[PDB]
Amino acid sequence: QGTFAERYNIVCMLGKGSFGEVLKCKDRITQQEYAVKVINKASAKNKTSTILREVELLKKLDHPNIMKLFEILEDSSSFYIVGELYTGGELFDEIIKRKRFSEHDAARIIKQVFSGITYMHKHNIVHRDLKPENILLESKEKDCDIKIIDFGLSTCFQQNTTAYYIAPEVLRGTYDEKCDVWSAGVILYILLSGTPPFYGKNEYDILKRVETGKYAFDLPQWRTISDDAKDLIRKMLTFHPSLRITATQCLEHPWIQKYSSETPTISDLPSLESAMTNIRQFQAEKKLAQAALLYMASKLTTLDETKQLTEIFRKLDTNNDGMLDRDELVRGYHEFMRLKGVDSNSLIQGSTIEDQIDSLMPLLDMDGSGSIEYSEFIASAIDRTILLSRERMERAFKMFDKDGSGKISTKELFKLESIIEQVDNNKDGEVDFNEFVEMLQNFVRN
Ligand SMILES: Nc1ncnc2c1ncn2[C@@H]1O[C@H](COP(=O)(O)OP(=O)(O)NP(=O)(O)O)[C@@H](O)[C@H]1O
Ligand SMILES: [Ca+2]
Ligand SMILES: [Ca+2]
Ligand SMILES: [Ca+2]
Numbered sequence: 315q316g317t318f319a320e321r322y323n324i325v326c327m328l329g330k331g332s333f334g335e336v337l338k339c340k341d342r343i344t345q346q347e348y349a350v351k352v353i354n355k356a357s358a359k360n361k362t363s364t365i366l367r368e369v370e371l372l373k374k375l376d377h378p379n380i381m382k383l384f385e386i387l388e389d390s391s392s393f394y395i396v397g398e399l400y401t402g403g404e405l406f407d408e409i410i411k412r413k414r415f416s417e418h419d420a421a422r423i424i425k426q427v428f429s430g431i432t433y434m435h436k437h438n439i440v441h442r443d444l445k446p447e448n449i450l451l452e453s454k455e456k457d458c459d460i461k462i463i464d465f466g467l468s469t470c471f472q473q474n475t476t477a478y479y480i481a482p483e484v485l486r487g488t489y490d491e492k493c494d495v496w497s498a499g500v501i502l503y504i505l506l507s508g509t510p511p512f513y514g515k516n517e518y519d520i521l522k523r524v525e526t527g528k529y530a531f532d533l534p535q536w537r538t539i540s541d542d543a544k545d546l547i548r549k550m551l552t553f554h555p556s557l558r559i560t561a562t563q564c565l566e567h568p569w570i571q572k573y574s575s576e577t578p579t580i581s582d583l584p585s586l587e588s589a590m591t592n593i594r595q596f597q598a599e600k601k602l603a604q605a606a607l608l609y610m611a612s613k614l615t616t617l618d619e620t621k622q623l624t625e626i627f628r629k630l631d632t633n634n635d636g637m638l639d640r641d642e643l644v645r646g647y648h649e650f651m652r653l654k655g656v657d658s659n660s661l662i663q664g665s666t667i668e669d670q671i672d673s674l675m676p677l678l679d680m681d682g683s684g685s686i687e688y689s690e691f692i693a694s695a696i697d698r699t700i701l702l703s704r705e706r707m708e709r710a711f712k713m714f715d716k717d718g719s720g721k722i723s724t725k726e727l728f729k730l731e732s733i734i735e736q737v738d739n740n741k742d743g744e745v746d747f748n749e750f751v752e753m754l755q756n757f758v759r760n
């Protein structure tokens with residue numbers, strides 16, 4: 315587990331749900347800010363080794379529209395789930411403010427809900443309470459990523475203390491992946507019309523409508539919305555779960571494809587060349603360097619540092635799922651050349667873009683998942699000198715400093731030999747901060 319207090323100080327309360335309270339916390343070394351869910355062990359535990367397993371699975375979710383968790387720590391009283399701090403508030407507030415959204419704006423929002431939800435399901439995670447309250451805006455910035463929160467805990471923990479979004483089958487006690495598609499459908503109905511499809515004076519009347527699956531597009535505002543959007547909603551608000559479309563099919567719907575047709579332009583050329591140069595250099599590093607850089611980028615960077623690359627990531631991510639596949643990387647490189655006025659055929663005079671991406675894929679796809687996930691993209695395409703600030707190297711050092719004050723050669727090896735002899739420049743067995751810094755610099759070096 316971990317020592318929370320050594321690492322973070324508590325800055326303020328952010329929110330309180332039924333599972334625990336969410337606090338703003340600050341890394342004592344980096345000054346970087348984080349959201350922490352504090353879960354009381356004794357009031358809440360329902361299962362601590364089974365909990366650690368499932369939190370591990372939550373931890374490795376790597377997708378732009380899913381809450382990012384960095385670590386789980388533990389005190390004698392509590393678990394501390396440390397994650398990314400989002401400052402845009404709930405999608406719910408954006409609906410109240412805007413009332414309802416153009417087809418273009420609704421499609422862009424719901425596409426991200428679809429992408430995140432598709433990703434969760436492929437990892438055998440059902441949300442169970444998908445609602446605009448449980449989707450946060452990354453920031454107050456204009457076109458920011460939305461982030462799905464508040465899921466994964468239900469088996470491990472007991473809660474303590476809305477009708478609009480629940481699928482009919484949840485009323486019968488069932489909560490399969492289709493219930494999330496229903497909830498997302500209710501959301502889309504709301505984004506486009508501003509009104510819930512199953513609506514009533516109170517909960518009693520609402521549930522009566524949910525139960526029969528009866529809704530319509532009778533409100534006057536529906537006149538001005540395409541049949542494409544209606545077709546999508548209808549597929550999502552299908553009563554029988556087995557006839558209801560999957561999240562993947564939602565994400566692939568022609569209405570979606572039409573309004574999130576994001577694609578590289580000339581204005582993207584500077585950031586695209588940056589990413590490519592960093593990627594080329596990344597691939598040239600040895601495996602040990604690549605792993606430490608990936609570890610460092612994904613644990614220690616900020617949302618503000620990844621924002622240009624996230625835009626590029628989106629423009630390369632043709633099918634809108636949260637990841638880059640091989641063909642997406644090939645097209646991207648081709649498009650990059652075209653925009654620049656360069657003929658891809660010039661590359662022989664000594665291999666094609668295809669050969670190059672194929673040999674790169676094993677290098678960048680570090681978990682062998684078949685796709686380049688967000689954090690693998692960021693680690694490879696960022697300017698890795700950004701990792702070499704003193705505070706970050708100090709936090710990295712400290713992460714591996716399990717015993718006392720220095721990193722044992724016997725720790726570091728089981729925490730990963732050829733390189734170990736080199737970094738230890740005085741040869742006293744253990745690795746101090748100075749050798750650790752030099753090793754990290756060597757990693758960024760080439
Ligand atoms: N990553 C985050 N960034 C900023 N605020 C957050 C973050 N996660 C949660 N919050 C806030 O903290 C509150 C509680 O979070 P939540 O994950 O819903 O708690 P919970 O007890 O696990 N589930 P619930 O009882 O349904 O609220 C939310 O209402 C948010 O306002
Ligand atoms: Ca993709
Ligand atoms: Ca991968
Ligand atoms: Ca050690």
Ligand SMILES: [Ca+2]
Pocket residue numbers: 738739740741742743744745746749
């Ligand atoms: Ca030494």
